[PDB]
C-alpha cells in the first residue's frame, strides 16, 4: 500500500500530448537505415526556391493558357504604367497564394523577413536605353510623380549587366510600404526589328524569415 495523490484532469483527452508505448513484438528487427552520401536534415531547403508571380489574371479562355506565365510589353504605350504590385502580404489574396511560403502561412499568423527582386534584360543586340526599378520605403504613399520615387532607394539597371543587380528590402512585417513600376523610357527599335518584347522577374526571401505563433486555421476548402 503506497500512498498516492490523484491530480485533477484524469479523463481529459489532450491533442498535444506526445506519448510512447511498448512494442507488442520485441523480436522483429526493423529494416536497417539506408546510407546515402548526401544528407539533408532541416526544412530550410525550401526557403531558397524561386517561384514565378504573375499579374495578368484577367483572361480565362482555354486557348490562352500558355500566355499567362508572362506579361507582354509593347512600344506603342508611351510613359504609362507597367505593373501595379498589390500590397505584399502572403496571407492575403493575390500573387502570393501560389507561392510555397504563403501556403505554409495558412496555419500561422505573424511573419517577418527580407525581400529581394532580380531582373534580367532580354532585348535586341543593338538597342540602347536605361531601365530603373525602385521600391518606395514605408510611410511614403503611392508615387504620383517620379520625383517622389527618386527619394526612395533606387538601383541603376544597365543593359550590359544582366542579373547581378540585387535589391533588398530590410524588413517587412504586419501598415507597410508599396512598390510600383513605371516605364523608365520607351523601348524603341529601328526597321527590321520586332516591336514587342518580354520581361522576366524574380522574387525570393532571405535567411531572416522566422515564425512565432501557430494558428488552427485551414484554408481548404
Amino acid at each position: 500500500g503506497f500512498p498516492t495523490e490523484l491530480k485533477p484532469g484524469t479523463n481529459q483527452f489532450l491533442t498535444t500530448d506526445d506519448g510512447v508505448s511498448a512494442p507488442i513484438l520485441p523480436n522483429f528487427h526493423p529494416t536497417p537505415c539506408i546510407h546515402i552520401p548526401g544528407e539533408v536534415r532541416n526544412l530550410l531547403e525550401l526557403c531558397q526556391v524561386e517561384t514565378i508571380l504573375e499579374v495578368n489574371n484577367v483572361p480565362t479562355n482555354a486557348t490562352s493558357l500558355m500566355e499567362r506565365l508572362r506579361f507582354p510589353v509593347s512600344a506603342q504605350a508611351g510613359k504609362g504604367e507597367l505593373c501595379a504590385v498589390f500590397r505584399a502580404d502572403p496571407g492575403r489574396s493575390g500573387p502570393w497564394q501560389s507561392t510555397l511560403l504563403g501556403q505554409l502561412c495558412g496555419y500561422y499568423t505573424q511573419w517577418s523577413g527580407s525581400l529581394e527582386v532580380t531582373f534580367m534584360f532580354t532585348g535586341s543586340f543593338m538597342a540602347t536605353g536605361k531601365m530603373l526599378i525602385a521600391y518606395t520605403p514605408p510611410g511614403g504613399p503611392l508615387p504620383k510623380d517620379r520625383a517622389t520615387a527618386m527619394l526612395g532607394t533606387h538601383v541603376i539597371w544597365d543593359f550590359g549587366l544582366q542579373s547581378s543587380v540585387t535589391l533588398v528590402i530590410p524588413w517587412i512585417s504586419n501598415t507597410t510600404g508599396l512598390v510600383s513600376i513605371w516605364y523608365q523610357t520607351n523601348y524603341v527599335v529601328p526597321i527590321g526589328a520586332p516591336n514587342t518584347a518580354y520581361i522576366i522577374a524574380l522574387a525570393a526571401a532571405q535567411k531572416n524569415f522566422t515564425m512565432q505563433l501557430c494558428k488552427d486555421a485551414s484554408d481548404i476548402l
Binding site: 484524469t10 496555419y107 494558428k215 488552427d216 485551414s218
Partner: protein
C-alpha cells in the same frame, strides 16, 4: 527584516476563484441552435479585471480543468473531449461549417474517474505580449482614414474559443452545470499604473456618468473631533 521565509511571495498572488459559468439549455430562445461558443474574455467581468489592470506587460500559458454536476451535487457518468481551434482560423458560425472536420487541430482526451485534468496551451498570439491599454488606433493596417468591414468584431486580439459536442448518435438529454477557475502561472510586470475606483458603465469602455461619487463621507464635520 530578520526572517523572510514565512513572507514568501507564493501566497501573495496565488488565489483561485470562480470566473466563468457556461449553461447548456435543452431548449431556449437566446440559443436555439443547441451550441454556444465562449471566447476567453477577461475584460468581461469587473471584479476580475480589477486585479489584472494593475499589470501592463505580460505573456503566459493557461491551465484549466472542467467539472460538471447537478444542483444537488450528484455525479453522473458522462465523458467529454475538447477540441481547440487556433485563433488565426475564423470561428464557426453555422453547424455546416468545416471547423468540426478539421483533423490538423491537436486534441487531448481524459476521463473523469482519473485525477483532475491538467492541460496547458502555448502562447500563439502573433504579437509579443498582450496589451490592455492602447493610446491610439487598434488596427495595424496601412489605411488610417477609413474603417475595416469587420469593425466591432475583431477576434484578432483574443486567444480563440472551444467547441463542445456530445458523443452519441442522438443529442444529449441532460443539462449540465459547469464552473471555471482561473489562475496565473508566471508573474512579471514592468510599468505600474493605478487601478479603478468608481464603477464601470459599459463593458468595453471605462466611461462614466454625470452622477459623481465620493470615496467616503464618514466624518460628519471636519471642524469638530
Amino acid at each position: 527584516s530578520h526572517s523572510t521565509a514565512e513572507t514568501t511571495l507564493d501566497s501573495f498572488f496565488s488565489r483561485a476563484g470562480l470566473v466563468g459559468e457556461i449553461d447548456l439549455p435543452l431548449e431556449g430562445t437566446t440559443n436555439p441552435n443547441g451550441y454556444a461558443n465562449w471566447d476567453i474574455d477577461i475584460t468581461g467581468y469587473a471584479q476580475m479585471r480589477r486585479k489584472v489592470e494593475l499589470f501592463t506587460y505580460m505573456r503566459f500559458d493557461a491551465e484549466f480543468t472542467f467539472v460538471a454536476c447537478t444542483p444537488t451535487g450528484q455525479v453522473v457518468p458522462q465523458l467529454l473531449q475538447y477540441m481547440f481551434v487556433p485563433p488565426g482560423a475564423p470561428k464557426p458560425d453555422s453547424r455546416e461549417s468545416l471547423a468540426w472536420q478539421t483533423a490538423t487541430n491537436p486534441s487531448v482526451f481524459v476521463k473523469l474517474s482519473d485525477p483532475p485534468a491538467q492541460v496547458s496551451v502555448p502562447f500563439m498570439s502573433p504579437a509579443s505580449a498582450y496589451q490592455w491599454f492602447y493610446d491610439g488606433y487598434p488596427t495595424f493596417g496601412e489605411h488610417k482614414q477609413e474603417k475595416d468591414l469587420e469593425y466591432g468584431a475583431c477576434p484578432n486580439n483574443m486567444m480563440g474559443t472551444f467547441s463542445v459536442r456530445t458523443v452519441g448518435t442522438s443529442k444529449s438529454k441532460y443539462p449540465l452545470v459547469i464552473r471555471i477557475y482561473m489562475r496565473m502561472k508566471h508573474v512579471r510586470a514592468w510599468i505600474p499604473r493605478p487601478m479603478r475606483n468608481q464603477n464601470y458603465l459599459f463593458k468595453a469602455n471605462p466611461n462614466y456618468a454625470g452622477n459623481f461619487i465620493k470615496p467616503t463621507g464618514a466624518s460628519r464635520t471636519a471642524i469638530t473631533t
